[PDB]
Ligand binder design. Structure first.
Ligand SMILES: CC(C)C[C@H](NP(=O)(O)O[C@@H]1O[C@@H](C)[C@H](O)[C@@H](O)[C@H]1O)C(=O)N[C@@H](Cc1c[nH]c2ccccc12)C(=O)O
Ligand SMILES: OCCCCC(CCO)CCCCO
Ligand SMILES: [Zn+2]
Length: 660
């Protein structure tokens, strides 16, 4: 009651009743929230996810600041990692020395002072395996897309100190984040013993030039959607002809030690011409520059762990782009904190209920699969079969709630009191070794690419698995006292979204066992592609601040938004079918079935930086929040019936798209 009444108030707070739902439902649902909530100090884009993440951080402080020392090695190591970084009386006493020292062990750089050595693949090997850096290219170990029960070596593009290749390329002419990034380079060049700006500026400029070629050679993420077409497996002998600049067998044999690599090693390469282009770019440029580039990468990875002269540098630039290390600790040692996190935040009740809600969403999804007009029955049968085989994890991975197993995983990491920078580096080397050690092991589903306190969720095509961290199994997504309409509208939609990823323009290319391999007739694939073109056409109709929204670019996450809204509503109808209507909320003027659509929209209430929107509109595969709402609701007949949106109001398009 008082919980219904508080929840009603916050619903009502957020809306803008001056706006008509059938005109713009997002404005109607969030216009109040938008206008009230301004983008705060430390943030450039704010909303539900921003909000809940920060609630969690604050919980992580009290967990980490224990007195009783009544926790496991792994948990104890996070406490140590935390204290170590929080002791900043110590960090101001060390200054640049830690990093400024590390460099010379590596052989120094022309910023201090002269530099001339034959040490290239050596320092390349070190920074990649010891400091978890990725200049030139990124190397790692994950499931073989075409043989999901194995891991393989993977070489991909990397090495840009900006978030996206287009900041190097567009911005030259459209606002100079280049000025702001050279600055930042220059000042860090000072902090690490570079003296005269006339001496730093040029050096640091050449790194910028090289970093832009990296970006020139780099491949636009539109030419990197479709895995079938960019997956290229080569032998290590084929890689050596392809990119002769690196001596690969020695290189691989050193970073994948203790595993032996011979000429027949399989290596998945996502762009052959890139790697060719890297090699030529490596063999063509002078070595000091090659060295200076490599160290710069090292400094970008590492500067966060030095003093408040650097933080200032990082802060300043991010205004152009001390909870601080509760983040860092979660980032690196998040599975270390998980047990603490879920003891505090996660009723085990919650797991059981979340498990029933998942069953119910699958059920509904499958009932849509059975009924889909664009597939023949044979294709519908294969799809159900892959649906049936989707594996789910809730809250946490099992192994973390067994201290014997969690301590084993973290046994080779050692955290030292008061040595934050050494602690970090030690972690980087440890983290690299965990990935390297997977090369000859089987992938399994109990291994997550997200820690439990994260406010997010995902699907893996190679494990055919949907994952929900305990961190998102929170309000507004889930609350066990909350009306079902609101639970099916929050978490229920998040679930359907993940299920639907099993079948999107990417996930459909992988079969039920997680393998990239045709498992439909081409005819059904041609038929799938036609449904999807509707959502391309649809979402390219949207614009933001006088600029289009990209319908091809956002297709996958739109397909998942649409399948999941729809599965969640059906599931909620299923629940009402079995159980009967719950009561209605009071101040609201709204039934439960309307509440469903409203709750959904209020999850996506958000504000963001005017620059961010021009940018997300090219980098984010997710649609802008408002068109996530509007694009989804607009394909729902059931949304329109329930808000009685006339025959061709904005929110009620006659060209409705439907794939899943
Ligand atoms: C439906 C939502 C609860 C979770 C949903 N996860 P999903 O899109 O399946 O997958 C996400 O996006 C993919 C492109 C990435 O490759 C994944 O690893 C993951 O980040 C999502 O849209 N996430 C967005 C929005 C978001 C959720 N939690 C966040 C926390 C911080 C920032 C953004 C988010 C994102 O991660 O970008
Ligand atoms: O049950 C197997 C768990 C093994 C845990 C590691 C596997 C990585 O794929 C990750 C742990 C985090 C190290 O940074
Ligand atoms: Zn998604």
């Amino acid at each position: 009651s008082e919980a219904c009444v508080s929840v009603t108030s916050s619903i009502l707070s957020s809306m803008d009743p001056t706006v008509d739902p059938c005109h713009d439902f997002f404005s109607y649902a969030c216009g109040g929230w938008i206008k009230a909530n301004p983008v705060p100090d430390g943030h450039s884009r704010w909303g539900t996810f921003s909000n809940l993440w920060e609630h969690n951080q604050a919980i992580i402080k009290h967990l980490l600041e224990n007195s009783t020392a009544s926790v496991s090695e792994a948990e104890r190591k996070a406490q140590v990692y935390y204290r170590a970084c929080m002791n900043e009386t110590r960090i101001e006493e060390l200054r640049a020395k830690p990093l400024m020292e590390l460099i010379e062990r590596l052989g120094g750089w022309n910023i201090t002072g002269p530099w001339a050595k034959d040490n290239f693949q050596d320092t390349l090997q070190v920074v990649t395996a010891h400091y978890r850096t990725s200049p030139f290219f990124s190397v790692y170990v994950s499931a073989d897309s075409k043989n999901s029960n194995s891991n393989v070596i993977q070489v991909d593009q990397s090495g840009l100190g900006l978030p996206s290749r287009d900041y190097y390329l567009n911005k030259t002419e459209n606002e100079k984040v280049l000025t702001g990034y050279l600055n930042y380079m220059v000042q860090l060049g000072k902090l690490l013993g570079g003296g005269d700006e006339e001496a730093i500026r040029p050096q640091m400029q050449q790194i910028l030039d090289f970093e832009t070629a990296l970006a020139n050679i780099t491949i636009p993420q539109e030419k990197r959607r479709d895995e079938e077409l960019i997956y290229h497996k080569v032998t290590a002998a084929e890689l050596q002809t392809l990119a002769p600049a690196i001596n690969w067998l020695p290189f691989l044999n050193t970073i994948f030690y203790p595993v032996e690599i011979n000429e027949s090693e399989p290596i998945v390469v996502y762009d052959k011409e890139y790697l060719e282009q890297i090699s030529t770019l490596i063999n063509t440029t002078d070595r000091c520059l090659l060295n200076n580039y490599m160290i710069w990468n090292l400094v970008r990875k590492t500067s966060s762990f030095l003093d408040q002269r650097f933080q200032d540098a990082d802060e300043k630039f991010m205004e152009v782009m001390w909870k601080f290390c509760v983040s860092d600790t979660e980032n690196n040692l998040g599975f270390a904190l998980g047990p603490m996190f879920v003891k505090a935040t996660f009723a085990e009740d919650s797991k059981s209920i979340a498990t029933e809600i998942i069953l119910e969403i699958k059920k509904a999804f499958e009932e849509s699969l059975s009924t889909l007009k664009w597939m023949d029955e044979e294709t519908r049968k294969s799809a159900k079969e892959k649906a049936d085989a989707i594996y789910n994890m809730i809250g946490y991975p099992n192994f973390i709630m067994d201290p014997k197993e969690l301590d084993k995983v973290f046994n080779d990491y050692t955290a030292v009191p008061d040595l934050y920078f050494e602690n970090a580096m030690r972690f980087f080397n440890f983290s690299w070794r965990v990935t390297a050690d997977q090369l000859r092991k089987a992938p399994n589903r109990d291994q997550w690419s997200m820690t439990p306190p994260m406010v997010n969720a995902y699907y893996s095509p190679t494990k055919n698995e949907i994952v929900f961290p305990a961190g998102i199994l929170q309000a507004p997504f889930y609350t066990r006292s909350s009306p079902k309409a609101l639970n099916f509208g929050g978490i229920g939609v998040v679930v359907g979204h993940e299920l639907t990823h099993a079948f999107d323009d990417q996930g459909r290319e992988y079969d039920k066992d997680g393998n990239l391999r045709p498992w439909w007739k081409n005819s059904s694939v041609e038929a799938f592609k036609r449904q999807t073109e509707c959502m391309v056409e649809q979402y390219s109709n949207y614009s933001v601040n006088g600029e289009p929204v990209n319908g091809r670019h956002t297709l996958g996450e739109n397909i998942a938004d649409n399948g999941g809204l729809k599965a969640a509503y059906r599931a909620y109808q299923n629940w009402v079918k079995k159980n009967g209507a719950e009561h209605s909320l009071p101040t609201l003027g709204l039934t439960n079935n309307q509440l469903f659509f409203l709750g959904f929209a209020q999850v996506w209430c958000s504000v963001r930086t005017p620059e961010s929107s021009h940018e997300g509109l090219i980098t984010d595969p997710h649609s802008p929040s408002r068109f996530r709402v509007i694009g989804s609701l607009s394909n729902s007949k059931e949304f329109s019936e329930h808000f009685r949106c006339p025959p061709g109001s904005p929110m009620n398009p006659p060209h409705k798209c439907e794939v899943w």
